[model samples]
Target: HYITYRINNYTPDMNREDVDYAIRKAFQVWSNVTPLKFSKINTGMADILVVFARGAHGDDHAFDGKGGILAHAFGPGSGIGGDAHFDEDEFWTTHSGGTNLFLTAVHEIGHSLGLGHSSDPKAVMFPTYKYVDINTFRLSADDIRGIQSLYG
Candidate 1:
C-alpha cells in the first residue's frame, strides 16, 4: 500500500530543508519495515498532512506551551485522519538537545498509520518521547510486530 503526505507548513525553529528531511526520514522508518510506500505531494489533498501549530490551533488537542506535549496525530482514516501536527512552542531540531523532529515524526506517523502506544520503551510507539541517536535508530520488535500486524 502507498501513502502520500504534504508539508502544510513548516516550523521556523529549523531550516526548511531540515524540516523536510526530518519528515521524510520519519516516514522512511515505517516504510523500511512494512510493505507501505510513502510519497510527498506539493498540492491538493494527501493521505497525510504535516502541520506545525501551537495551542488551540483548529483541533481540540491544544498543545501546552513549551514542553508538556510535543506533538500528536490522528489515526488512519479520512479528513483529518493521518494528519501529524507538531507543537510550534517547542524547539524542533534535526538532532538531539531540542525536540528531534525525525523521532517525533516517526512516533506520530506510527499513530497516523493506525498503531497505538506500545509498552516497549524502545518502540517508537511508546507513550513518551525520548531522544536517541537518529543515525542509530532502529524499530524495536514490538514496533515491527504492531505495524506488521496492521498492514500485513
Candidate 2:
C-alpha cells in the first residue's frame, strides 16, 4: 500500500516545505525496512492524510497536550483509513521549539502501515512517544524485526 499526505491549514509558524521534508524523512525511515517507496510526487494523491487539528477531527480519538498519545493514523485503506492525525494542541518544532514533527509523524505512519505500537521503547514503533532528533532515529532492532515480519 502506498501513502500520500495532504497537510491542512498551513501553520504560519512553519513553512510547508519543512512539513513536506519532515514527512519525507519520516517515510524514508522505513524505506529499507519494508521495501516500500513513498513515491516522490505531491498532488493531493497518497495513501495517508497528514494534518494538524484538535479534538476528534472526525475520529473517535482526540489528543491532549501531553501524555497517553501524541498522534495517530489508520491502517491501509481508502477514505480516511490511511489518514494521519496530529495534535495541534502541542507546539510543533523542527529544532528545540516544541514537539518534533518528524518524530511523531514517523510513529503514526507505522500505524498507517498496519504496524501497531511496540512494547520496546527503543523501537520506532513504541507506543510511548520520544522526542529523539532526526539524526538519532534509526529503527531499533525490534522495529527492523517487527516490520520485517509484516512486509518482508
Candidate 3:
C-alpha cells in the first residue's frame, strides 16, 4: 500500500519550514530501506495524519505534558490508524539539545508503518527516543531487516 501522509500542523517552537523538512526526512528514512513507497498530500485524509497536540487530543491516550511522553502514533488499520501526534508542551527543535523533531518523527512513523519496538536498543524501532547525527543517521541492521520483511 503506497502510504500517504499529510502533516496537519507544525510545531510552534520550531520554524515552519524546518518542521516540514524534518517530516519529509523522517519519512524518507523508512522509504530508503523498504519496498513501500510514501506520498504527501495537502488536502483531504491521507493514510497518515501528522499533528501536534497536548493533553487530551480526541484520542483515548492523553499526553502527559512534555518530558515524559514525547509523542505517539496509531498502528496500521483504518480510521485514526497510522496517525502521529506530537506533544506541543515540549520545546521542539532541530538541535540535539532538546527533543529533536526529526528524531521523534522517525520513531513515531516507524510505529505508524507497523514496525514494533525492536529488541535491539540501537534500532530506530526502540521504544525510547534519542538524538543521532541526522546527517549520519542509518537504520540499525535490525530495522532494515524488519521493515524489508514487511514490504519485500
Candidate 4:
C-alpha cells in the first residue's frame, strides 16, 4: 500500500517554513535509515505532513499541557492517518538543545508508520520524552528492526 499526508499549524510560535524544516529533518531520520523515502514539499503535497496544533480542534487525543502522551499519529489510512500530531503544549526544538523537537518528532513518526511504544530506553520509540544525544539519537537497532518488521 501507498500513502500521502500534509501538515498544519496550531499556534504561530514557529514560522511555517521553520516548522517545515523541523518536519523534513524529523522524517529524514527515517529516510536515511530505511528504504522509505519521506519528503516535505513546498506545495504541501507530500505524504505525512507535520502538525503543531493542540486542544479539541479534532482527534481523539488532545494535548494535556505537560504530562501523558506528548504526541501521536495514525498509520496508513484516511484523513489524519499517517500524519503526525505534535503537542503544542511543549517546546519543540531540534534533537539537541532546548526541548529536542527533532527527537520527539522522529519518535512520533515511528507511530505514524504503525509503531507502538518500545520498552528499550535507548529506542527512539520510547514512550517517555527524553532528550537523547543527537549522534546517538538516530534510530537504534531496535527502532530499525521494528520499522523493518512493519515495512517488510
Which parts of model 3 are misplaced by more than 4 Å? Answer: 13-15, 55-70, 122-125, 148-152
What residue runs in model 2 are displaced by over 4 Å at the alpha carbon?
1-11, 42-44, 51-70, 77-81, 93-98, 121-125, 148-152
Cα lDDT of model 2 overall?
Answer: 0.57
lDDT of 1 by residue, 35-144 (tens): 56767556777656565556564455654465455555446555364666565555565565566655766775677665656756544456766667777776667676
lDDT by residue (1-152, candidate 2, tens digit) is 65443444554555678766766666676556664555556656454455444654434454444544555544554435344555554666565555676576666667665465567654445575666777776666667645544533
Q: How accurate is candidate 4 locally (lDDT)?
A: 0.57
lDDT of 4 by residue, 1-152 (tens): 33333455533667877766655666676555555554333545455555544555445564445544555645544544365666555666555545575566677667775564566765445666667665665555766665553533
Candidate No. with top TM-score: 3
Question: Local error of candidate 4 at 148, Å?
Answer: 2.8
Clash pairs (backbone) in predicted model 3: none
Candidate 4 regions off by >4 Å?
1-22, 39-46, 49-52, 59-68, 77-80, 93-98, 122-125, 149-152
Worst 10 residues of 3 by lDDT: 143-152
Task: Report lDDT (Cα) of residue 79, candidate 1.
Answer: 38
State residue 79's C-alpha deviation in candidate 3, in Å: 7.3
TM accuracy, model 3: 0.70
Give the range where candidate 4 is weakest over 10 consecutive residues by summed lDDT: 2-11
User: Which scores greater on TM-score, model 1 or model 3?
Assistant: 3
Score each candidate by Cα lDDT: 0.62, 0.57, 0.62, 0.57
